[PDB]
């Protein structure tokens, strides 16, 4: 029946709805195999039909039949996968599970093959193919009993990639870059899921198994990050460029937050944080390179600061070696310093300059407060403390040179001393060798002096 | 055993992804990069099933990604397509050969060795065909084919314990020959002479490697298999 429809129906939307109905009903028939709740099939059918009606209405409203086809096929694939997975849940028989999974793979193959002909838009077609392939791999993977959280996270990654792809298609970018992005991330995801399944079959320990997820999340994030700047470099609209920067930064931050929450090993988490900080910092710097109105630049700086703090805070929640934790949070802070300095160079009025300078000074100060709140040893805490005092100096003087006039300069003159005092006093409450503590407080008494002397030089 | 069943479908899925990108794409460099990353990313599953070193596999994947980044940066710079395509192919070649060389060490079983050899041979033949289809610069295509063939010969030689230096020397000579061919091309020499020199050096290299392997062997049927392989290589 679907063959006749696809061969002979003259309208793309009509054909898409026809094959969607056929596929959904045939998926229901397949689901009839083993007594899984009929309400699930009813819900899938109703969702497919309501979505089809909405798409038909939008087409009647003059909307693109290609977008409707992509949406309808996306929903169809989702429904088929959900039904097959629920069927997989209804039994404990291993052979039955792998048989059901093979049938589900066949269904995914059929839906993908059908999609490639109907979808006229290259980008949407690529996205639909990636979606279908990812869901196929995950639904199959469940058969052997691996934790579902990893599969859910991979689905989330694929979905985020698709969201970015549709956003950029709305932006009107060159299709080749987007197609490369979608297919590349899809390949990474598929191979990651397969490797995890292989480790599961081998009965590997979880301290080993987790490593693959960190390996995958890094490459997937960096792969999407690299695409962002390639696309952005060919845009021409400031609002659109800022939108792309903020959106991708938020998405990548959310994905890394989830991954850091999931993983459960020390060294793996340390390396993952170290990589993610750099990824987000690089993306932020890339976006900063392009011009903007002062508020638009200010928003970009604020978002980056929020992200890097949010990731660092996540790691604080986890048990990890003290020295490695210090290096991680100290290294992360330095990245905020750089982007703060790079952004400050583009401003041309005191109001934004003073606001950004204070904001970064406070933010960089805050992170150290949290790190010192959990440091395990005096020597580690001291070294991190010295670096913090030095860091805020670099931020202070680097701003001072660009500061315009004393009426503005008074704020940094006050705030820098405030920050130094807060850091030194907080460090004073912790247990440490007195000789090191005296040196740390001495450096604080020292650095504020030059800041004041440079400030005195109007 | 069934881990092989898992790896089979994983690899088939990866190949399907490669083909879909190849048809959907509209820019040669991006298509080459997509396929290059996909193939290597897939092979790791088969290597892992056999019990290969996981850290080496991860490093190889990282290396492939780095090569892709370098090629993308060059293409964005407007560099020549031919050089970039050759670079990507060569990087994938060394990466995959490294994975095979690691896998070869996993066990003494002849059965696993045969499986590894078959996998490597299939991948190598497909890669050679693809490279011949894509590369336009004559010298680049010829050198790509020669490198692939030589690597395949070394991989086969490993299965019988032949001296590794017998392979390494031919690899060094082949690298020198490819550099010389590129130099002659830059020097304005006739292309035909460069191609002839490349093929002749490759012929002597593979002949010497196989002859050393035959000398190192002591099994009749193993000698027969070596003879068959040499005949196939010469035909190609």
Numbering used by the authors:
A (entry chain V): 238 to 695
B (entry chain Z): 2 to 237
Give me lines lifted from the publication on this model.
To generate expandable nanocages, flat cyclic components that form the faces of the cages were linked through noncovalent handshake interactions at the specified angle. For the flat cyclic component, we used a ring design with 12 repeats (R12B) constructed from curve units, and split the 12 repeats into either 3 subunits with 4 repeats each (C3) or 4 subunits with 3 repeats each (C4), depending on the desired polyhedral symmetry architecture. We then fused linear THR arms onto each subunit constrained to point outward parallel to a radial vector emanating from the symmetry axis, but offset such that when the C2 interface is formed, the C2 axis is along a radial vector. For tetrahedra (T3), octahedra (O3) and icosahedra (I3) built from flat C3-symmetric objects, the out-of-plane handshake angles that are needed to join the flat objects are 70.5°, 109.5° and 138.2°, respectively. Tetrahedral, octahedral ‘cubic’ and icosahedral structures with C3 rings at respective axes (T3, O3 and I3), and octahedral structures with C4 rings at the respective axes (O4) were constructed by incorporation of the appropriate C2 interface. Designed geometric features including the spindle-like twofold handshake interface and the flat ‘in-plane’ ring areas with distinct holes are clearly evident.
Here we describe extendable linear, curved and angled protein building blocks, as well as inter-block interactions, that conform to specified geometric standards; assemblies designed using these blocks inherit their extendability and regular interaction surfaces, enabling them to be expanded or contracted by varying the number of modules, and reinforced with secondary struts. We construct twistless helix repeat (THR) protein blocks from identical straight α-helices (typically 2–4 helices in each unit); the length of the blocks can be varied simply by varying the number of repeat units. Restricting helical geometry to ideal straight helices with zero helical twist in principle considerably limits what types of structure could be built, but this is more than compensated by the great simplification of downstream material design, as illustrated below. Using X-ray crystallography and electron microscopy, we validate nanomaterial designs ranging from simple polygonal and circular oligomers that can be concentrically nested, up to large polyhedral nanocages and unbounded straight ‘train track’ assemblies with reconfigurable sizes and geometries that can be readily blueprinted.
